[PDB]
Amino acid sequence: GTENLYFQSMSVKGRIYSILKQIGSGGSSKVFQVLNEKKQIYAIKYVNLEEADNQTLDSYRNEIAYLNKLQQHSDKIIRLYDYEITDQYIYMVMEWGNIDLNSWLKKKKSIDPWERKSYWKNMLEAVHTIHQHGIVHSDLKPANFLIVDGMLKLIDFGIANQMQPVGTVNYMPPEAIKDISPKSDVWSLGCILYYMTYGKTPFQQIINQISKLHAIIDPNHEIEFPDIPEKDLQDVLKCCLKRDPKQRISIPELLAHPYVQIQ
Numbered sequence: 001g002t003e004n005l006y007f008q009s010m011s012v013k014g015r016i017y018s019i020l021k022q023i024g025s026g027g028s029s030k031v032f033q034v035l036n037e038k039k040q041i042y043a044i045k046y047v048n049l050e051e052a053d054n055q056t057l058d059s060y061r062n063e064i065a066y067l068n069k070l071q072q073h074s075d076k077i078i079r080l081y082d083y084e085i086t087d088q089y090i091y092m093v094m095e096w097g098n099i100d101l102n103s104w105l106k107k108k109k110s111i112d113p114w115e116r117k118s119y120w121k122n123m124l125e126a127v128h129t130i131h132q133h134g135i136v137h138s139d140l141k142p143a144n145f146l147i148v149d150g151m152l153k154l155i156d157f158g159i160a161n162q163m164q165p166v167g168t169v170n171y172m173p174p175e176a177i178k179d180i181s182p183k184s185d186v187w188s189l190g191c192i193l194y195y196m197t198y199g200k201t202p203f204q205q206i207i208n209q210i211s212k213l214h215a216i217i218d219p220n221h222e223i224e225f226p227d228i229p230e231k232d233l234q235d236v237l238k239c240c241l242k243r244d245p246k247q248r249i250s251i252p253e254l255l256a257h258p259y260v261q262i263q
């Protein structure tokens with residue numbers, strides 16, 4: 001009713017799209033569920049550039065170049081079918097998903113270990129691909145993963161500068177708080193998998209943000225890893241959540257880990 005839009009429409013590279021409903025918003029951006037002339041479903045991401053400075057415009061141009069390139073490198077990265085860039089906006093014709101990983105983790109009280117593992121593999125493949133091109137996301141959270149036919153797709157690369165018209169610290173690595181390295185993404189992914197394992201992020205129980213920030217960097221604040229039937233899973237978590245990035249496990253090391261390899 002009030003969630004669904006009527007008689008609305010838009011053009012991207014001359015091709016006409018019917019706007020069904022608005023499925024997202026963040027900053028000066030909107031995401032719409034659309035149909036093309038062939039009745040195929042897509043997500044059009046609209047970005048408003050009217051108040052963007054040259055540095056911000058460049059951050060959007062750089063992210064689009066990378067997303068259009070790296071999609072041929074891994075199916076764990078969202079499809080970018082087409083885009084229209086002008087001085088006033090960006091319209092990006094993307095792959096449509098039923099739900100994002102944040103919303104889905106909020107619904108599901110219990111996640112299947114086979115499903116949790118499949119999800120882990122998808123996230124590792126997506127992040128591994130962007131690291132191979134010199135990109136460290138540095139702001140990974142479950143909201144950055146779209147579920148498309150039971151498979152996770154990474155939505156963005158963290159390159160673009162979010163425009164102020166919020167951001168959780170729960171996934172922030174200790175080295176980020178101290179101030180960049182692929183290991184920063186390993187910590188954040190670790191927090192996502194810890195949520196899929198224990199039903200919460202490692203520091204979710206701490207209400208005060210400053211207490212939480214000191215808890216992430218404190219070497220004497222021991223992170224609890226309750227015993228679970230999957231000992232390989234427990235080892236992954238312990239290895240991702242090492243406060244020294246130099247001692248923390250690497251993505252190529254995680255891809256050869258028994259948790260991901262041993263049936």
Ligand SMILES: CCc1cccc(CC)c1NC(=O)c1nn(C)c2c1CCc1cnc(Nc3ccc(C(=O)NC4CCN(C)CC4)cc3OC(F)(F)F)nc1-2
Binds near residue numbers: 026097
């Ligand atoms: C534009 C904002 C932005 C800026 C910077 C960075 C990023 C990446 C995170 C982004 N954000 C984005 O770029 C972005 N945000 N969303 C939400 C989508 C995108 C791009 C592709 C895309 C494709 N399909 C979807 N679909 C849906 C995504 C999430 C939900 C959802 O939240 N469902 C909830 C279920 C529970 N109930 C109670 C509440 C709703 C439902 C969806 O499917 C639908 F079509 F059916 F609706 N979303 C997106």
